[PDB]
Swiss-Prot record, chain A:
UniProt subcellular location: Host cytoplasm; Host nucleus
Name of the protein in its database record: Polymerase acidic protein
Function: Plays an essential role in viral RNA transcription and replication by forming the heterotrimeric polymerase complex together with PB1 and PB2 subunits. The complex transcribes viral mRNAs by using a unique mechanism called cap-snatching. It consists in the hijacking and cleavage of host capped pre-mRNAs. These short capped RNAs are then used as primers for viral mRNAs. The PB2 subunit is responsible for the binding of the 5' cap of cellular pre-mRNAs which are subsequently cleaved after 10-13 nucleotides by the PA subunit that carries the endonuclease activity.
Subunit structure: Influenza RNA polymerase is composed of three subunits: PB1, PB2 and PA. Interacts (via C-terminus) with PB1 (via N-terminus).
Changes after translation: Phosphorylated on serines and threonines by host kinases, including human casein kinase II.
Family from the record: Belongs to the influenza viruses PA family.
Segment of the intact protein contained: 559 to 608 of 709
Swiss-Prot record, chain B:
Oligomeric form and interacting partners: Influenza RNA polymerase is composed of three subunits: PB1, PB2 and PA. Interacts (via N-terminus) with PB1 (via C-terminus). Interacts with nucleoprotein NP (via N-terminus). Interacts with host ANP32A (via C-terminus); this interaction promotes viral RNA synthesis.
Protein origin, superkingdom: Viruses
Statement: the UniProt record of this protein carries the keyword Transit peptide: no
Family: Belongs to the influenza viruses PB2 family.
Localization terms from the record: Virion; Host nucleus
InterPro entries named among the record's database cross-references: Flu_PB2_2nd, Flu_PB2_6th, Flu_PB2_C, Flu_PB2_CAP-bd, Flu_PB2_middle, Flu_PB2_N, INV_PB2, PB2_helical
One of the protein's GO biological processes: viral RNA genome replication
Protein name in UniProt: Polymerase basic protein 2
A single GO molecular function term of this UniProt record: RNA binding
Alphabetical UniProt keywords: Cap snatching, Eukaryotic host gene expression shutoff by virus, Eukaryotic host transcription shutoff by virus, Host gene expression shutoff by virus, Host nucleus, Host-virus interaction, Inhibition of host RNA polymerase II by virus, mRNA capping, mRNA processing, Viral transcription, Virion
Acetylation among keywords: no
Predominant subcellular localization, coarse grouping: virion
From Swiss-Prot, chain C:
Cell compartment(s), UniProt: Nucleus; Cytoplasm; Endoplasmic reticulum
Main location: nucleus
Modified residues (Phosphoserine): S17, S158
Function per UniProt: Multifunctional protein that is involved in the regulation of many processes including tumor suppression, apoptosis, cell cycle progression or transcription. Promotes apoptosis by favouring the activation of caspase-9/CASP9 and allowing apoptosome formation. In addition, plays a role in the modulation of histone acetylation and transcription as part of the INHAT (inhibitor of histone acetyltransferases) complex. Inhibits the histone-acetyltranferase activity of EP300/CREBBP (CREB-binding protein) and EP300/CREBBP-associated factor by histone masking. (Microbial infection) Plays an essential role in influenza A, B and C viral genome replication. Mechanistically, mediates the assembly of the viral replicase asymmetric dimers composed of PB1, PB2 and PA via its N-terminal region. Also plays an essential role in foamy virus mRNA export from the nucleus.
UniProt modification remark: Phosphorylated on serine residues, at least in part by casein kinase 2/CK2.
Name used for this protein in its record: Acidic leucine-rich nuclear phosphoprotein 32 family member A
Boundaries of the shown chain within the full protein: 1 to 158 of 249
Swiss-Prot record, chain D:
The protein, known as: Polymerase acidic protein
Functional note: Plays an essential role in viral RNA transcription and replication by forming the heterotrimeric polymerase complex together with PB1 and PB2 subunits. The complex transcribes viral mRNAs by using a unique mechanism called cap-snatching. It consists in the hijacking and cleavage of host capped pre-mRNAs. These short capped RNAs are then used as primers for viral mRNAs. The PB2 subunit is responsible for the binding of the 5' cap of cellular pre-mRNAs which are subsequently cleaved after 10-13 nucleotides by the PA subunit that carries the endonuclease activity.
PTM comment: Phosphorylated on serines and threonines by host kinases, including human casein kinase II.
Subunit text: Influenza RNA polymerase is composed of three subunits: PB1, PB2 and PA. Interacts (via C-terminus) with PB1 (via N-terminus).
Family stated for the protein in its record: Belongs to the influenza viruses PA family.
Subcellular localization(s) per the UniProt record: Host cytoplasm; Host nucleus
Signal peptide as annotated in the record: none
Amino acid sequence: IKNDWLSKARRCFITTMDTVETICLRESAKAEENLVEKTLNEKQMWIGKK
Amino acid sequence: MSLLLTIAKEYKRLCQDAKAAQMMTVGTVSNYTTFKKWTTSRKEKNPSLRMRWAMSSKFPIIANKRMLEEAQIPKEHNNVALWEDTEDVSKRDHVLASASCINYWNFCGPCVNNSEVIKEVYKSRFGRLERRKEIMWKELRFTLVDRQRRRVDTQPVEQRLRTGEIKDLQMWTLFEDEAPLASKFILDNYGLVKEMRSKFANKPLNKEVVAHMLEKQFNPESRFLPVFGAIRPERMELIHALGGETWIQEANTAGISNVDQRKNDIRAVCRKVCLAANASIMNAKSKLVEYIKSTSMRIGETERKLEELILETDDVSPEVTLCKSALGGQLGKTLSFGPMLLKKISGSGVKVKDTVYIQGVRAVQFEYWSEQEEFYGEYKSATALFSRKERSLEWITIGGGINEDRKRLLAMCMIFCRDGDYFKDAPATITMADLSTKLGREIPYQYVMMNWIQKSEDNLEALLYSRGIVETNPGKMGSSMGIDGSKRAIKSLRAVTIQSGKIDMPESKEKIHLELSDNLEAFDSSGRIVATILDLPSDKKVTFQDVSFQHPDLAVLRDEKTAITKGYEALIKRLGTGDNDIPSLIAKKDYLSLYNLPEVKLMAPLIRPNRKGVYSRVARKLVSTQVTTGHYSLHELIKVLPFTYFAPKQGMFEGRLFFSNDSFVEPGVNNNVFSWSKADSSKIYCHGIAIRVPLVVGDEHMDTSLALLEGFSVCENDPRAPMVTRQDLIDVGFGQKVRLFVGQGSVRTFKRTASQRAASSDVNKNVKKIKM
Amino acid sequence: MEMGRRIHLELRNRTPSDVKELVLDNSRSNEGKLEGLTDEFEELEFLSTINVGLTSIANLPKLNKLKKLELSDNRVSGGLEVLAEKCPNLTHLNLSGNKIKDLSTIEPLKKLENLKSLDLFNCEVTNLNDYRENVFKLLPQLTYLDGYDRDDKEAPDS
Amino acid sequence: TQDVITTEGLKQSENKLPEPRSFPRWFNAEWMWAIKDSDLTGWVPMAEYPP
C-alpha cells in the first residue's frame, strides 16, 4: 500500500492548485474582473514568526 | 453445419450426465438467470492496486486460442513474448497472453471490410461531438453565479420510451428468431423497428453491445443538479464547461438539436383538445378520451400517437396533467394554481366553508383548508417557500430576481391561502355575471379573484395593500419588499421576507393516482384540486404542422377530400384476412374480382366521367402485370383500384388519373393527394391524413417478418397442425392452423385470421350498462 | 430481403437450368456483391437487378444465352470488361443511376460485337460536351442510345 | 489602463490575407454549358421598339 500510494504522491499538485484557485477565483468574483495575477503577486499569507 | 452437430453432441454429453439432466429437466427456463449468478463470482477490494500489480507480469491478459492460430499471430514477433500454451483455470478454454499482442494485432492483424458501423452504434456520442462543434464560445467572465438545485435531463433524446417497450426493440432489431409474441408497441411503431433493423442486419458485430448502447440511446439521464440560466438538454450535457459558482463561460447554444419545440407543440395540442371537449357538459370525459385517441403527430420521420407521447412525457403542466389523468397515467406530486407551480412540503388540513358577500348582501360559499402547510412555489424567474395556517398566510420567503414576477407570485400565493379581508368582504367591482356560469359552470371565489388581479394592475396593488404595511425596522431593510418589489424601503409589506438566491427545488420520486370529475376537476385521493380547466390560456389561433386530427368535429376540410379519404380507408379495410379479400384474391391470381369489390363500386361515382374509360384501361392493365408475375406494389394497387369499375375504352393517356374535384394521382410518383415512402410502408398520407394499413401481407419493399404479424392470431391448441419455420409464415394459407415456437420455451398455435377488436370500447360499453 | 432467399423463393422447385427470365428487384446484396449465381443458369435470357445497393461486378458467372441486362439504381463503377467474356452474345444494356465518370471505363464494351442498344441517364458522363457523338464514334455497332438512335429516332416498344 | 492591457494581453488585430489558389479546371465546363441553348427561352426582359 505504501508503494502504491507513494507512487501516487503527485496528488499534492491537485490539492494545492485547488486551494490557490479557490482563493483567487473568490477574490476575483467579489470585483467581477480578472484578478488572478494581482492576487498571486500581492496577496500576503502569514507563514511564520521571526 | 458441422457446428450444429457439435452443439447436438455437446447436448447429448450433457444429458448423459445425471445432475445436469436433473437441472435441465425440472422447472422452466428462467432458472438460467439464477444459474447465471452462482458462477463466476469473484470481486476485489482495491482494483487499482491489483491491476498495477498484475500488469507487471509477463502475460496479464487471458485470450482466445483458435482465433490467434487462425490469425497467424505467433508467440514472438521479434524477441518479445506474447503468449504461451496454457489454460486459464476458471474458463478452461483460454490461454494467457500479454498486452503487447493487441498492438501487433492493431498494426498488422486482420482487417474488416468496413468499420463505419460504429457511428451508428454510438450515435449518442457522435451526436455529442457534432453538437459541440457548433458552439461559438464568446468569453470567460467572473461573478457569483446563482445556482438552483433542480432535477433535469442531461441527454437529448428523440422518441423516449419505457424499459418495457425498449426490451422488444432490442429483440426485434437483432434476435428476430427468438422474438416474443408481437406486442402492441411493435405493431404501432414499425417504422422505427425497420429503420433500426436495416442498419444492424447482415453485419459482424457483438450483438449484446449494440443492444446495451440502444438502451442508453433511449434513456434520458435525469439528474438532480445545480443549474443556472436556461434549461435545455443541449446545455446540461456540458454544463461543467459553461459555468460554476465563480465563473461563467458565455456561449450561444440555441440552435442545436431543438427539443423544446415539440414539447411546446404537444402542450398546445393538449390545450386545444381540453378546450374543445368542454362543450359536452354531460360527457366531456368520454369526448376527451376519443379526441385524444383519434389524433397523432409527426416526430422527425415517424408518426406517433398522441396518447403514447403523453404517457412518455414528463411535462408537469396543468394541460398535460388532466389528459394523463383521463388515460390513467400516474403522475408526479406537483400542484398548480394558474400559471404558477407549487409543491407541498408538509402539513395537512380539511375543507371548511365560509361566506363572502359579493355586493351588499350576496352570500357565496368558499372552502378553505384548516392546518399549517408549507409550500414551495415557482413563478417565472421567481420562487418562494411560503406557509399557511388556518386561513392566514403565516410567512413567505422569496428568493427571485424580478420585481414584477415577485409581485405576481406574492399575489397568487395570497389567493392560494384565501387570506385577507377581501375574501371576507368581496371587492365592490366584482359582479355576479363574472362570479360563475360563464358557460353554465360555477367558478369558486379564488379563481374569481385570480381573474380580477389579472384584469388590471390596480386590483393587484389593492390586494397587496390589503396585506398590512409596516415601517421597515433597522437592519431588516434588506429583507423587505415594497409595493414595487423593491429590495429595501422605509415601509414594507407585513411578514414578506426577501433574500437573494433561488430557493432550492424539493424532490420526491412518488407517483399518485388522481381521477377527474365531470367538470375536469382532478382529485387526487383527497380533496385537493391538482388542476382544472380554469388555469389555461383563454384561447389562441395556431397552424399546427405535421399533425393528424382524424376526427369529424376536429376537421376543416370539405366533403370532397373527406369522401375520398373515407373511400381509401374503406378500400384498405378490405385488406384484412379471410376469403373474398384483396390478399387472397391476389394469391389466387383472381384480379378480375377486384373490379367488382363493393368499395370500388361505392368510389366509382367520383371518377371523372368524361375519361373514366381511358383511366380504367390503364389501371386495369397495370394490376394484371403486377398480379400475374408476382411482383407487385401494394400501394400502387390500392391507389389505382378505384378506377377499375367501368368498361375500358380507347384514348390517349396523358399521365394523371383525375377525380371529379380537379385532384389527380400520377401512377408511381408520390403527391399530396396520395403519398407514401419505402421507409415507413405502414402509412398512407391522403391529403395529409395518416391511414394505417394493416400488416397482413408483405410487399417487395416492405417484405420482412413483421409485415404479416397482425394477420396471425393464437387459437385453441391442436397438435395435428404442422410445425413450420418463421420464414415460411409467408406461404401459409389464410384460415390455416399451424404450430410455432415463440420467444423462449413457448410452443403455441397460430391461425392466420386477424381477430383484434377494440378492447376499450367493449369494456366501456359493458361497464356503463352496469350503472343502469 | 436478400438475394439468396429471394432467388430460392422465385425458384418454386424449378431447376436452375430451364428458366428464361429472372427478377431480383428491391432486395439487398451483401458487400454490394452478387451471391448465389453460378453457371448452372444456361437457358437464362433476361436479368434485372435494381436498387440492391450494388457497387461492383466480380462474382458474375459465365452466361452465354443472356441477351438483356439491367443494373439501374446501383453505384457500379469501373467493371465493364467482364461482359466481353461472360455475356458476349449481349445486345441490350442499361446503367442509368450508377457511378460513371469518364469514357475509358466504357471502352471495353466495343468488344461486344452483338451490342445494339445502350442506356446512360443521370450519370456524370452525360454532363459533358458532344458525348453522344463521341460514344457513337467509339461503339460503331451501336444504333440506339438511351432509347434514341442518331437523329433522335425513338425506338419502338419491343 | 496598462494593467488591463497586460491582463487581457491585447495586441493589434493581425490583418489576414487571402490565400493564393491554383488553376480552376472546371471553368471550361461551365463556359461550354453556357454556350449551350436551353429548352426554355426569354428569361431576360427587354423594352419595346419605338417607331
